[PDB]
């Protein structure tokens, strides 16, 4: 974990003082003595497995290319931009993900490397919702698929997911989508960017069959203790089914 690495690096050094605004550098520190540093885990950009562009690639192949032969890196920046409603965190979330283009690709001759070039981004909560929910969906895809090939499996993380998704309990994500984007007030803040909210509608639409594999594989892997779980799951599940049909107004598939 991050600060175990931070410890090991401070070991390496005297003057064990850390920068704290982990994202940006410090100009005074560009010249001042008393060596500074800052540590923060970053995101290993996915590879581009050649010749695998669409093929029915298994899991091991993808997981191996997931971490290695990497030369791009991002780091997602929580940042408030807009009005800071108390009930929600999403009204302002703007992510200035930082691009990390280094010289070579891990693994390498050296367990580390410099960066050759950096840049940033800027992400709307519209988009934020888009890809965050999206990646959530394929995470569901991962769990369903991994128990679609494996059988002698601990079905427990499936319960993790189905619980956490089924009730956005401490915080209701889906109504948050509705209020933040589906509501026409946003389509006066971002009228032309209804092009975005319709994508999110498409996303929850595609979510529906995806959560449907979640449900059916739960039922296949349902055990008696999973039963109360699954009854609430299926209840709220065809609930959200009709929600996407009409209440979300998304065209299902």
């Amino acid at each position: 974990r991050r600060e175990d690495f931070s410890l090991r690096l401070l070991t390496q050094f005297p003057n064990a003082e850390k920068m704290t605004s982990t994202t940006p550098p410090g100009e005074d520190i560009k010249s001042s003595p008393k060596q500074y540093m800052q540590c923060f885990t970053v995101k290993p950009v996915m590879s581009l497995p050649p010749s695998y562009k669409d093929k029915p690639v298994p899991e091991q192949i993808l997981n191996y290319y997931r971490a290695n032969e990497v030369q791009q890196f991002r780091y997602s920046r929580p940042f408030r931009k807009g009005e800071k409603d108390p009930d929600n965190e999403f009204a302002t979330m703007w992510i200035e993900r930082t691009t990390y283009t280094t010289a070579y690709t891990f693994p390498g001759i050296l367990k580390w490397f410099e960066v050759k070039q950096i840049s940033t981004e800027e992400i709307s909560p519209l988009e934020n919702a888009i890809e965050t929910m999206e990646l959530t969906n394929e995470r569901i895809s991962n769990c369903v698929q991994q128990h679609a090939w494996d059988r002698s499996l601990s079905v427990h993380p499936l319960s993790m997911l189905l619980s956490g998704i089924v009730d956005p309990a401490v915080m209701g994500g889906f109504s948050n989508y509705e209020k933040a984007f589906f509501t026409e007030k946003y389509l006066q803040e971002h009228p032309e960017d209804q092009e975005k909210v319709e994508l999110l509608k498409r996303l929850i639409a595609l979510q529906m069959p995806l959560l449907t594999e979640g449900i059916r594989i739960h039922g296949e892997k349902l055990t008696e203790q999973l039963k109360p779980l699954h009854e609430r799951l299926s209840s709220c599940f065809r609930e959200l089914k009709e929600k996407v049909e009409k209440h979300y107004g998304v065209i299902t598939l």
């Binding site: 410890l7 090991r8 070991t11 005297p14 064990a16």
Partner: protein
């Protein structure tokens, strides 16, 4: 850990029971031992008897006090402490007289028993003392009017029991009622009485003072300075002790505003001088306690001068400005015209300049800038006033001498007075908080109310006479001031006891001949020690101490299989602690039972900067030792238990393999702390090595000796016109 000798051949008695000596084992609960003893004396009802040492204690054996059962100490079985408490409720409060008196002598002897005190305070028999000597005083009035010697003895033993049960505090201090202080007052207010009554009554006076400030106020009306003196006049030493202790208490808990008043009343009723003439040079003895009492009297006068010492009063206030003007007039007018007494501001500046460049004052816009540093400020002014009343001779002559010299030989009178007063205040402990620690007393202070002030005047007199004997200047004003302070020290070590003796000693110290005597004493104290060579040795000290420190630091690096909180059951009594050459990271903690000790890796407690480290506490100072539950370790690892502070929640509550390495580690950590060491090994090795080292320096000079004192400097040709050039 291991228990002491439990199998102990002790005598076991009961008053009237012939002892039978077995091999008692102390492990079983004391109910069983008392059971076998009582059955041996055919006694049932075991809970109503508790063994007690037949020692002079008469203290009942409970579980708290049976590790005092040593081979040969007779055990005297008797009533258990609760039974003794109940016996005392019925034979301390009752209407019998002889039974009360003897039972109360018992209760006085037995109050020191904490084991008895538990249940007696649960019984609240000190309230029963309240009834027996405040109610009981008016039940037997008709004939106690004639029994008053015996009745006063009874009430004195009541006082003994009251104080020796109040000290426990498990019962609150205010258990007495107001009639208790009425009786104590009748003891202190009235004429002379029995020694025991007056003794314990003054004791209880100072006890209520100790209890609370409200109790102080309510006892003050019964303790009058006019009536507190005959107790001193009560020639017995102890009556004097307690009356002076009450004097100190009245000084202590009074507000400072009333403290000045009571210092004045001490002055007028002769308390200073009368205690001098009753104890100090009289036929009565100065104990350690009398030393404390006289010391706190003098220090209380001192700290009521401290009210003008500590603070920074106005330098430019018009009232103090005018009073220093009248002081400087009665001082300087022997060399001033009558015009400058009330001259204009411009003339004030002019006379400042003329008359204070004769006194080397840097800030001549106001001489109060020589009184703007406190202590004393205004009490240097008070010293000037006292001289105007008592020592205007020394005042005037010292002023005129320095009022006739622009040159640097001058005595800067505002400056000299301020700094003389402040130095003799620190040296003489003028204005300090009274504490029993300092256990001397100066009779010279008790020979005069303002002997502080005459001390200051005589030291200015000796200062300037020795300047005219030591041609002293004001660049040496600090130097020759330290010379005068040395004179004061060579007086005080001889302990002048009055005004005349202080005069004689200081004059004999006035660089006439005894210099050769005291530097001969210095020659004697170098003859086995080589004092100039001591200067040599300790001059470059830090090398050896620093190398010792990094030595021991290396030792921390190579460390040991350290020991833990109760590292006993499959626990790592052995865990490594390797400092990395970082000297900021310590590799230690819950490390396995290590044969070779230190494997250098990220130890289970891998980090330890000096940064989190505040300090270390050793042994019983360890809060895990001060932990009274699951972390109850036995105290023999005192020399092994430390506790270093970091994050104020995680401690280094850990045990050492033995003592000297514990000391070495603590030395290294203090070196990280940048302080002294705490191995005696450290001092021993450092002294022997540096001594031998400097002995390894004499190799050059020997077979011819050293001029110990510094020779003069043979003069040079100031130019660098080298006849033979350098290089």
């Amino acid at each position: 850990m291991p228990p002491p000798a439990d199998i102990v051949k002790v005598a076991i008695e009961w008053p009237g029971a012939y002892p039978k000596l077995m091999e008692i084992d102390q492990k079983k609960p004391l109910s069983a031992i008392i059971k076998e003893v009582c059955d041996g004396w055919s006694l049932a009802n075991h809970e109503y008897f508790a063994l007690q040492h037949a020692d002079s204690s008469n203290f009942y054996i409970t579980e708290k006090n049976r590790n005092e059962i040593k081979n040969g100490t007779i055990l005297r079985l008797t009533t258990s402490p609760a039974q003794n408490a109940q016996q005392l409720h019925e034979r301390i409060q009752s209407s019998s007289m002889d039974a009360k008196l003897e039972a109360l002598k018992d209760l006085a002897s037995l109050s020191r028993d904490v084991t008895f005190a538990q249940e007696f305070i649960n019984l609240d028999g000190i309230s029963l003392l309240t009834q027996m000597v405040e109610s009981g005083t008016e039940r037997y009035q008709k004939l106690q009017k004639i029994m008053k010697p015996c009745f006063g003895d009874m009430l004195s033993f009541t006082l003994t029991a009251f104080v020796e049960l109040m000290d426990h505090g498990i019962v609150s201090w205010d258990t007495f009622s107001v009639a208790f202080i009425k009786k104590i007052a009748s003891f202190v207010n009235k004429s002379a009485i029995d020694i025991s009554i007056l003794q314990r009554s003054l004791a209880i006076l100072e006890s209520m003072v100790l209890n609370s400030h409200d109790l102080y106020q309510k006892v003050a009306q019964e303790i009058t300075i006019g009536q507190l003196i005959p107790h001193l006049q009560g020639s017995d030493q102890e009556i004097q002790t307690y009356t002076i202790a009450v004097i100190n208490a009245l000084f202590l808990k009074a507000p400072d505003e009333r403290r000045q008043e009571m210092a004045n009343i001490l002055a007028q009723k002769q308390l200073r001088s009368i205690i001098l003439t009753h104890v100090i040079r009289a036929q009565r003895a100065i104990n350690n306690e009398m030393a404390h009492q006289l010391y706190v009297l003098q220090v209380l006068t001192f700290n009521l001068l401290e009210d003008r010492m500590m603070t920074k009063m106005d330098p430019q206030d018009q009232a103090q400005r005018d009073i220093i003007f009248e002081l400087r007039r009665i001082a300087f007018d022997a060399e001033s015209e009558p015009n400058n007494s009330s001259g204009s501001m411009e003339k004030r500046k002019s006379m400042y300049t003329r008359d204070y460049k004769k006194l080397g004052f840097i800030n001549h816009v106001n001489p109060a800038m020589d009184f703007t540093q406190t202590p004393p400020g205004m009490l240097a002014l008070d010293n000037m006033l006292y001289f105007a009343k008592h020592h205007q001779d020394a005042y005037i002559r010292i002023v005129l001498e320095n009022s006739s010299r622009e040159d640097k030989h001058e005595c800067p009178f505002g400056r000299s007075s301020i700094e003389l007063t402040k130095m003799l205040c620190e040296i003489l402990k003028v204005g300090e908080l009274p504490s029993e620690t300092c256990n001397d007393f100066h009779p010279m202070f008790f020979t005069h109310d303002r002997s502080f002030e005459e001390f200051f005047c005589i030291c200015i007199q000796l200062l300037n006479k020795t300047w005219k004997e030591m041609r002293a200047t004001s660049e040496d004003f600090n130097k020759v001031m330290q010379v005068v302070k040395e004179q004061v020290m060579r007086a005080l070590t001889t302990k002048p006891s009055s005004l005349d003796q202080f005069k004689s000693k200081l004059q004999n110290l006035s660089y006439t001949e005894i210099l050769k005597i005291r530097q001969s004493e210095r020659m004697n104290q170098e003859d086995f020690q080589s004092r100039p060579i001591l200067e040599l040795k300790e001059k470059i000290q830090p090398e050896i101490l620093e190398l010792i420190k990094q030595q021991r630091l290396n030792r921390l690096v190579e460390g040991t299989c350290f020991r833990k909180l109760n590292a006993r059951r499959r626990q790592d009594k052995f865990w490594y602690c390797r400092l990395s050459p970082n000297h900021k990271v310590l590799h230690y903690g819950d490390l396995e039972e290590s044969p070779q000790g230190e494997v250098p890796h990220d130890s289970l407690q891998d980090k330890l900067p000096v940064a989190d480290i505040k300090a270390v506490v050793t042994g019983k100072d360890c809060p895990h030792m001060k932990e009274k539950g699951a972390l109850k370790q036995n105290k023999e690892v005192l020399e092994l238990a430390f506790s270093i502070l970091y994050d104020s929640n995680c401690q280094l509550n850990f045990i050492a393999p033995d003592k000297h390495e514990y000391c070495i580690w603590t030395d290294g950590l203090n070196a990280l702390l940048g302080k002294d060491m705490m191995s005696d090994l450290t001092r021993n090795d450092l002294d022997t090595l540096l001594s031998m080292e400097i002995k390894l320096r004499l190799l050059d000079l020997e077979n011819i000796q050293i001029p110990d004192a510094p020779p003069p400097i043979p003069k040079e040709p100031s130019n660098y016109d080298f006849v033979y050039d350098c290089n």
